[PDB]
Design a binder for these strands. Structure first.
Length: 135
DNA sequence: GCGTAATCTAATCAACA
DNA sequence: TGTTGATTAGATTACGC
């Protein structure tokens, strides 16, 4: 990988309380739920998404260690993020960047956002998918 | 150093031209 | 329908405290 990752966030206690309470309600929130929590506690939705991935990993691993069944999905699955439209010039920017560095740090990713107008979070997924499809 | 946010791979679901 | 964006499980990495 590269270097220069995002500076880790530190949850305030109230933020932790809010994430844990949301998680009780449903450990598989949709984009509508994630954006709703994001705005309630004043952090960007992408940080919320990463915290649910990590909190599920922790719950699964504890359930596993306690030899307990994971409830899993409950209720109707909530809607996904709408698919991001990526123009041909946006794709071109990204492709050039990818040729020089497959593993951009937060620095590189945030300027691509400036340049392409795409969200940094979507750029990060773009590279994940590109790497996994173009060794 | 600990705890865990941030990052990663791989497999898969699914939108859209 | 094929391309590719979005999500998941789970492993790993590297920071703030």
């Amino acid at each position: 990988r590269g270097r220069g990752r995002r500076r880790r966030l530190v949850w305030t206690p109230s933020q932790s309380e809010a994430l844990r309470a949301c998680f009780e309600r449903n450990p598989y929130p949709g984009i509508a739920t994630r954006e709703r929590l994001a705005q309630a506690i004043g952090i960007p939705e992408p940080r919320v998404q990463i915290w649910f991935q990590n909190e599920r990993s922790r719950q699964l691993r504890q359930h596993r260690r306690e030899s307990r069944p994971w409830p899993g999905r409950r209720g109707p699955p909530e809607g996904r993020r709408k698919r991001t439209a990526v123009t041909g010039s946006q794709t071109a920017l990204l492709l050039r960047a990818f040729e020089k560095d497959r593993f951009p740090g937060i620095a590189a990713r945030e300027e691509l956002a400036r340049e392409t107008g795409l969200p940094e979070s979507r750029i990060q997924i773009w590279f994940q998918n590109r790497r996994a499809r173009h060794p």
